[PDB]
Amino acid sequence: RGFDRAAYAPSGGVFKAARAGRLQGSTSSLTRFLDLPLLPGVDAPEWE
């Protein structure tokens, strides 16, 4: 059966790759404390 060393020599391929993005990054929250006067339309507004 005919065979060639050159035929078996490697091209090296196309090396295809696909971009991916994964998950989310943790942060320290900037909590803000508010002291507005209590207003109507809010349930139980006394010690809130």
Added chain:
Amino acid sequence: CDVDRLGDHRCKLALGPWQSAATVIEADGADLIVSGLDETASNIFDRGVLDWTGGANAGTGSDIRVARPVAGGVRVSLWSAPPFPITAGDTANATVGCDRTADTCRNRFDNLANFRGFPLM
């Protein structure tokens, strides 16, 4: 991408400038050294075809597995040895090779209109 073989009607390749004309400086079967090819042409003709106008092949070309520029003109390594013994100085036609990677297709030709590429799924 199905740009694939360049110049396919569905592929609608621009063709034109990339194609080049070359002659063989030396005959080494698969590794024949060629002349008339620019250093820039090498590595762009990688995965290309090297139709030989001269000789029995008469425009039939073994695929160039790898194109690397060397002294004395680019040395072309074909995927397979050419059918029939190829004389040095035989007329040849040099063709670009399309990797078909979507990015490669885009960089070389950018045929968005005819890219059968599905890079992101």
